[PDB]
mmCIF file of C-alpha atoms (C1' of nucleotides) in Angstrom:
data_model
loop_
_atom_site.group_PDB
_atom_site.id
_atom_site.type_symbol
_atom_site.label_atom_id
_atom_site.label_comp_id
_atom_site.label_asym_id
_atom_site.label_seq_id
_atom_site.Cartn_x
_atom_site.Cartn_y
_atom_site.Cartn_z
ATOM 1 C CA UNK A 1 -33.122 44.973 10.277
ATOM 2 C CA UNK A 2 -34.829 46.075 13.394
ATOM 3 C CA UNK A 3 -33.760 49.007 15.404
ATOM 4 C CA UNK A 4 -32.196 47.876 19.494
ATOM 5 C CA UNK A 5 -35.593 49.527 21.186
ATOM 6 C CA UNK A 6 -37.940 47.623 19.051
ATOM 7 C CA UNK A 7 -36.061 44.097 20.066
ATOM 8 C CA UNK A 8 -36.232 44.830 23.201
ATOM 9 C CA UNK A 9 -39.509 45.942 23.826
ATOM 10 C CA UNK A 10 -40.912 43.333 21.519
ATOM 11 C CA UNK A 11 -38.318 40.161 22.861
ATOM 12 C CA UNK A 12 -36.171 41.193 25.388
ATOM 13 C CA UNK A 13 -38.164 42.897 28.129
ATOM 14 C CA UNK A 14 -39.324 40.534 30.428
ATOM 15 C CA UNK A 15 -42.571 42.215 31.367
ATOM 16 C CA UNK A 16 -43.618 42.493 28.052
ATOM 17 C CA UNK A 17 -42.147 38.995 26.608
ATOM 18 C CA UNK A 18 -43.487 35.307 25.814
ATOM 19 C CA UNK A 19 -41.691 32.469 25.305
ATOM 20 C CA UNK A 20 -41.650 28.261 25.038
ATOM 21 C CA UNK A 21 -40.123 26.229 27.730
ATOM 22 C CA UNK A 22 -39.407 22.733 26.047
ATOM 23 C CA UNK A 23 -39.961 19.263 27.747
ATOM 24 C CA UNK A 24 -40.089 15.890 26.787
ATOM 25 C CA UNK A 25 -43.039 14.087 27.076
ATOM 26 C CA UNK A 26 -42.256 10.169 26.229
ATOM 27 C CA UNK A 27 -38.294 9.122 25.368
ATOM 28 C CA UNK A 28 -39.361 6.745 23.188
ATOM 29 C CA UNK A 29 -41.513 8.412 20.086
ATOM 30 C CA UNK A 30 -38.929 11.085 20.571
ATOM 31 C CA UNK A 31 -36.060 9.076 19.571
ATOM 32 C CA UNK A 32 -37.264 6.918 16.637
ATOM 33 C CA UNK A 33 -38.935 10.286 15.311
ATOM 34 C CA UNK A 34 -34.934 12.040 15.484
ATOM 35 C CA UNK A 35 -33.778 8.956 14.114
ATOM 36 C CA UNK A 36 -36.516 9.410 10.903
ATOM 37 C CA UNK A 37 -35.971 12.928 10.432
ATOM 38 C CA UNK A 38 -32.109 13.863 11.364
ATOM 39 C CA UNK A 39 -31.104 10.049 9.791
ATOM 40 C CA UNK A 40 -28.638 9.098 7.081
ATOM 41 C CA UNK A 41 -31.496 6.717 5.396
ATOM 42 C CA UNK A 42 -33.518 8.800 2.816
ATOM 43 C CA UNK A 43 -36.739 6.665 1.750
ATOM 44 C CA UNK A 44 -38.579 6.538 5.883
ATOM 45 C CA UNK A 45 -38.065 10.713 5.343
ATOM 46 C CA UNK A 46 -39.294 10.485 2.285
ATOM 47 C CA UNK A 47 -42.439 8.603 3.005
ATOM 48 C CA UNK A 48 -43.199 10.954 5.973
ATOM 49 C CA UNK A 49 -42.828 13.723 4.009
ATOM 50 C CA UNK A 50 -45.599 12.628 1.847
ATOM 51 C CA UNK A 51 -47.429 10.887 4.102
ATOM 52 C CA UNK A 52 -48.202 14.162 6.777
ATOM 53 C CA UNK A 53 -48.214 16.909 3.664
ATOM 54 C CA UNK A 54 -49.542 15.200 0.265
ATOM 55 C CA UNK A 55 -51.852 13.553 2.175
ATOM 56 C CA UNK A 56 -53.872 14.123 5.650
ATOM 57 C CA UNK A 57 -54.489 17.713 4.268
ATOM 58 C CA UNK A 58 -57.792 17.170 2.505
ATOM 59 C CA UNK A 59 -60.236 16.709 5.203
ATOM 60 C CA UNK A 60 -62.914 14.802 4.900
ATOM 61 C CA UNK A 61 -64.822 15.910 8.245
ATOM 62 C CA UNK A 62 -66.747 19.357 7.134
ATOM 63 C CA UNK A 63 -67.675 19.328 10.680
ATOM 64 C "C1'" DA B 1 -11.497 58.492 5.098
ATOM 65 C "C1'" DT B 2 -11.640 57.250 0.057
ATOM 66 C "C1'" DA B 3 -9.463 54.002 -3.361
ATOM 67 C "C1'" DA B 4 -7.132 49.089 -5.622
ATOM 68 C "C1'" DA B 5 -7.336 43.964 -5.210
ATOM 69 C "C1'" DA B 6 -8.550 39.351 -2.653
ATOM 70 C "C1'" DT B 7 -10.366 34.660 0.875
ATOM 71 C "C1'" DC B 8 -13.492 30.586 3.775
ATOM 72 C "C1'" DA B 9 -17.268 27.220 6.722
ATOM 73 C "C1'" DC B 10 -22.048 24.537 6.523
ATOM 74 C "C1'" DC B 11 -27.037 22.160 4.389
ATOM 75 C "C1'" DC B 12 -29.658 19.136 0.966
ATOM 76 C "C1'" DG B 13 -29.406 13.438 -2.934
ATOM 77 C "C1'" DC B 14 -26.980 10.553 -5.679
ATOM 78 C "C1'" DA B 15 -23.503 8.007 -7.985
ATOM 79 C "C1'" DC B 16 -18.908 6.006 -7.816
ATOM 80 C "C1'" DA B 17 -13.679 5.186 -6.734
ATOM 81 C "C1'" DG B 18 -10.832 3.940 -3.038
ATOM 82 C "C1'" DA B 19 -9.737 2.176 1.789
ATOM 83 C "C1'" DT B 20 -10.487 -1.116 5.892
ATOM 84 C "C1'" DT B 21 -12.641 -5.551 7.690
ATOM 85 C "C1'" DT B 22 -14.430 -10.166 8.139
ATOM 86 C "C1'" DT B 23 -14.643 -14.726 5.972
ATOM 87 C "C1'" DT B 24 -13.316 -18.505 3.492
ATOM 88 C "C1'" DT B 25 -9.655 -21.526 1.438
ATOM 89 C "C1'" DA B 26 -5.500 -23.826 0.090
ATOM 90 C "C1'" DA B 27 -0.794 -24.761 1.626
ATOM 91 C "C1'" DA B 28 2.347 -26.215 5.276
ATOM 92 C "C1'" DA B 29 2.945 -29.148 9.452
ATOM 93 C "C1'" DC B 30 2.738 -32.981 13.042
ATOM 94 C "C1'" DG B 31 2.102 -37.778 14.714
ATOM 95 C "C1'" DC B 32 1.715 -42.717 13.669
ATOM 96 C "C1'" DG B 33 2.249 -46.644 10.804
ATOM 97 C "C1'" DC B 34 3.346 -50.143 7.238
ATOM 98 C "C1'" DC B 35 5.259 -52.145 2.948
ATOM 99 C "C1'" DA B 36 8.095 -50.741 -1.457
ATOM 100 C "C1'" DC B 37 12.342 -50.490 -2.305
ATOM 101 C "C1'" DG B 38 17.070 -51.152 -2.321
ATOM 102 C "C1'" DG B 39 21.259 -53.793 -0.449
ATOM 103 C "C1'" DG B 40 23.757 -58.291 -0.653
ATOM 104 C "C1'" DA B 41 24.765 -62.837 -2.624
ATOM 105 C "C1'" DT B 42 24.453 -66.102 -6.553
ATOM 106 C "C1'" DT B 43 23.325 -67.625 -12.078
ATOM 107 C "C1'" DT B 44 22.947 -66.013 -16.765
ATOM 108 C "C1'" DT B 45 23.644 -63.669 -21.164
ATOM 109 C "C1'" DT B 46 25.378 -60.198 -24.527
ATOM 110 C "C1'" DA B 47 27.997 -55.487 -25.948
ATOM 111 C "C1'" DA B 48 31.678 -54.319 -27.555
ATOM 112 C "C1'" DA B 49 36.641 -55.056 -28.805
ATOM 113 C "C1'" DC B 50 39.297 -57.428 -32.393
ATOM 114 C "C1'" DC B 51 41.057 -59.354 -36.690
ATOM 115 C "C1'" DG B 52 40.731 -58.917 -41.634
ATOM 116 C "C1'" DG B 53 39.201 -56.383 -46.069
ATOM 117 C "C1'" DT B 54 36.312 -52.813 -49.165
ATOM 118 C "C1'" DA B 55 33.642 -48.553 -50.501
ATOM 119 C "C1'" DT B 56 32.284 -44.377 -49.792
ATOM 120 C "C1'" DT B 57 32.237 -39.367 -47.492
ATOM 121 C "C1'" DT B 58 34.593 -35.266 -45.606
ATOM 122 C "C1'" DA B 59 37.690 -31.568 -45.110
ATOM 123 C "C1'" DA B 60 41.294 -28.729 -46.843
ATOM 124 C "C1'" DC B 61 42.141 -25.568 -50.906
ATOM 125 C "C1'" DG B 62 41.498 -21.852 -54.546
ATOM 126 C "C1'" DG B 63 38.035 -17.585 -56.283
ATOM 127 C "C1'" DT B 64 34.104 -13.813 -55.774
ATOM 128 C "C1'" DG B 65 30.693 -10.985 -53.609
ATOM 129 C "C1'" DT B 66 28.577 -9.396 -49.804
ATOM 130 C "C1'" DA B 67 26.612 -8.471 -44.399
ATOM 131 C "C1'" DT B 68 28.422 -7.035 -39.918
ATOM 132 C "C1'" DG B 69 31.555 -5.411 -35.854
ATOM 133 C "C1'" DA B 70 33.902 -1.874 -33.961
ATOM 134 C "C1'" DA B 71 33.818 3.035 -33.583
ATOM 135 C "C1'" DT B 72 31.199 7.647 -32.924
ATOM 136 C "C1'" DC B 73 27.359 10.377 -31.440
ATOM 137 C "C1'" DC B 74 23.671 11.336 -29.128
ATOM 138 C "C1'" DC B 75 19.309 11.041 -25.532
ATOM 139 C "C1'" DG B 76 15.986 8.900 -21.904
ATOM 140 C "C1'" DT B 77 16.976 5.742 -17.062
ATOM 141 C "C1'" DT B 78 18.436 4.733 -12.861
ATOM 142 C "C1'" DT B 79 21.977 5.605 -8.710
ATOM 143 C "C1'" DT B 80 23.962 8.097 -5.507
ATOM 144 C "C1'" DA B 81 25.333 11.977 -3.077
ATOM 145 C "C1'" DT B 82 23.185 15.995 -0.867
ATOM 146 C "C1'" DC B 83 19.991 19.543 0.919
ATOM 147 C "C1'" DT B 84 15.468 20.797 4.258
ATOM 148 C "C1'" DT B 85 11.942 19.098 7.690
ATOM 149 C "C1'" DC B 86 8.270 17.826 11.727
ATOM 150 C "C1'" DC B 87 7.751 15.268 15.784
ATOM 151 C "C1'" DT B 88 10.097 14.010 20.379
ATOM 152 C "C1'" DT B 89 11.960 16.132 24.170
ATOM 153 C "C1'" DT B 90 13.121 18.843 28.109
ATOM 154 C "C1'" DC B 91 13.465 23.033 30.371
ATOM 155 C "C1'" DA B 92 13.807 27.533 32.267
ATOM 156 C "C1'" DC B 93 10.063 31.009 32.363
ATOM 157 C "C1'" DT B 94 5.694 32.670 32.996
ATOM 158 C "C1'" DT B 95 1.189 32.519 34.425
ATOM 159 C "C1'" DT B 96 -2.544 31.253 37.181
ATOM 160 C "C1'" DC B 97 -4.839 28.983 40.944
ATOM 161 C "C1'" DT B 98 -5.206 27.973 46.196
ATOM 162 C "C1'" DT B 99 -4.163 28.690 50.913
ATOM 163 C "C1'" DT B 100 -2.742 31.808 54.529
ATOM 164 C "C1'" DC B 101 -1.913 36.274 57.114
ATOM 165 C "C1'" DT B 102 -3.136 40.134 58.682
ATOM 166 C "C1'" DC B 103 -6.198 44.747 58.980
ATOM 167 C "C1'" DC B 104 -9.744 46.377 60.638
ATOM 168 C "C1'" DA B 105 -14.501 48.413 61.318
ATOM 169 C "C1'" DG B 106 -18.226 47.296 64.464
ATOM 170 C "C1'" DT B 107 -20.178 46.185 68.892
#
DNA sequence: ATAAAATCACCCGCACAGATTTTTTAAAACGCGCCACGGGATTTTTAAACCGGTATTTAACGGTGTATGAATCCCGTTTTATCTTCCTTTCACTTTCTTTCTCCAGT
């Protein structure tokens, strides 16, 4: 939907451009956390689905 | 360049039918041993053949009235003879990669 100059100028030039360089920080959280999200099992995706959006969302801080 | 008509991959949960994969279990087997059973040589007893005779019990024979066996006509069942096929295989050809041989401009 975007015309060639305005993806270039906005992604493409590389004066003008940002972008994310990804590293991994500890092998082991980064594992078990693929394992919970990309698994075959349904109920640990489940749970941290409603664990990190249900809940942890109404702060209780006001500070 | 305008019209007419078509086709396929993946993501997300859940329930179930079907296809491997271990795991357990009952049957078959092997080695060793002993005593239950059958062979051989005497005693004993009884099953059946044999004479009677008598008293029944069966089968062959002569009428009636059916039930069935061989023949005919079909249609689903299974066999056998008869076509096409995909993987194995090499193999001559082609292509593509690697090393070598010069040219050759520059100093």
């Amino acid at each position: 939907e975007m015309n060639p100059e305005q993806l270039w100028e906005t992604t493409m030039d590389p004066e003008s451009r940002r972008m994310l360089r990804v590293t991994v920080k500890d092998a082991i959280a980064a594992d078990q956390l693929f394992t919970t999200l990309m698994g075959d099992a349904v109920e640990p995706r489940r749970a941290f689905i409603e664990e990190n959006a249900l809940k942890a969302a109404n702060i209780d801080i006001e500070n």
